[PDB]
């Protein structure tokens, strides 16, 4: 029965690909070369940088380093607004609440720590610690000041209630380590990519997997939602990125090149969704054209692998964080 179910899924999918994305997008003008330069350089981390996340104001950002520091920067002036001494230095992810009041991080401690930034004293206290995951913490993203979603190496994702500190919902069904997650703009769905080489779309309200997407031949390390919420992009260890559309339940475009054989560490879109920025293990970040399968730029300024990558909500700047301990704002 399972074999026939898979065959039916395959046939109902192949009956939808009347024409490849490249055909319909064939004639639109190419973006041409994209050239961005390093307008800032943030210094102060003394180890590898593993994650960064822009604030919603597009000015402040948080970076997590294995030096055991969570640093909140003002990217305009480069002033360090805050420096938080994490209890566990083996951090892998960090998030900035949409309201600018809280930050989150976590990692090999299997805990999601939540820190309050706006306090009467004026110092940053630890506000909450979320402890129900059995593997390490790969990614975390607030929904508001009281709800956060986490993905774990234990092959599960969770929706938490920060006030009570309890897992409100659990998302099971992945077979490998879940490595990244991206909330939908509306905040009602979210996609997760795992080491089983598949992505899954989850309904936050209900707690069930709505769709599964396959095609990658290795781990999915990064996943980003397209701006309009009807598509997403996955970057993998097979040196490929791919673009999936929820309503088609099928792979549309695949961004790869022979000269590229390393892994992908992070993916993001530009504010219009026209550019797909992908960090790589070979110390670079490629600027793909999402609609047309053609590379259109390189952000080459780091000495070690580009571990993290982000775009501001206003779309003005890009942020690259690297194992070489430096962050760069690109424009």
């Amino acid at each position: 029965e399972a074999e026939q179910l898979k065959n039916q899924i395959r046939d109902a999918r192949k009956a939808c690909a009347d024409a490849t994305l490249s055909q319909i997008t064939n004639n639109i003008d190419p973006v041409g070369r994209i050239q961005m330069r390093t307008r800032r350089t943030l210094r102060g981390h003394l180890a590898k940088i593993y994650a960064m996340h822009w604030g919603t104001d597009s000015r402040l950002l948080v970076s997590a380093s294995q030096d055991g520091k969570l640093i909140i920067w003002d990217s305009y002036t480069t002033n360090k607004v805050h420096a938080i001494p994490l209890r566990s230095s083996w951090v892998m992810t960090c998030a900035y609440a949409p309201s600018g009041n809280y930050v989150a991080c976590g990692g090999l401690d299997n805990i999601c720590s939540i820190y309050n930034l706006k306090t009467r004293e004026g110092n940053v206290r630890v506000s909450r610690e979320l402890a129900g995951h059995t593997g390490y913490l790969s990614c975390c993203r607030f929904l508001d000041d009281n709800q956060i979603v986490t993905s774990s190496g234990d092959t599960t994702c969770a929706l938490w209630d920060i006030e009570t500190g309890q897992q409100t919902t659990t998302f099971t069904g992945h077979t490998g380590d879940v490595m990244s997650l991206s909330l939908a703009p509306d905040t009602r769905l979210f996609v997760s990519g795992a080491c089983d080489a598949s992505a899954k779309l989850w309904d936050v309200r209900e707690g069930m997997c709505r769709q599964t997407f396959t095609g990658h031949e290795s781990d999915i390390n990064a996943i980003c939602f397209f701006p309009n919420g009807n598509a997403f992009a996955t970057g993998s260890d097979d040196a490929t990125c791919r673009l999936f559309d929820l309503r088609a339940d099928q792979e549309l475009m695949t961004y790869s090149h022979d000269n590229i054989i390393c892994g992908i560490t992070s993916v993001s879109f530009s504010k219009s969704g026209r550019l797909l920025l992908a960090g790589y293990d070979d110390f670079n970040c490629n600027v793909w054209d999402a609609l047309k399968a053609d590379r259109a730029g390189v952000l080459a300024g780091h000495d070690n692998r580009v571990s993290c990558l982000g775009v501001t909500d206003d779309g003005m700047a890009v942020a690259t964080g690297s194992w070489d301990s430096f962050l760069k704002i690109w424009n």
């Binding site: 319909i24 309009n228 309503r247 779309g315």
Partner: protein, 51 residues
């Protein structure tokens, strides 16, 4: 039984031909092309990271 149950719920789903999805993506990208700084280099006066 759990695996077949999940797949069976993923089969009876309203799909669309990929051409429609490609058209939607292309249209959305075209509609917001005039507001993407990284795509259309903004004047230096209005860019907060230059002056």
């Amino acid at each position: 039984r759990k695996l077949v149950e999940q797949l069976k719920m993923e089969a009876n789903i309203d799909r669309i031909k990929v051409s429609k999805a490609a058209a939607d993506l292309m249209a959305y990208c075209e509609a917001h092309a005039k507001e993407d700084p990284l795509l259309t280099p903004v004047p230096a006066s209005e860019n907060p990271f230059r002056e």
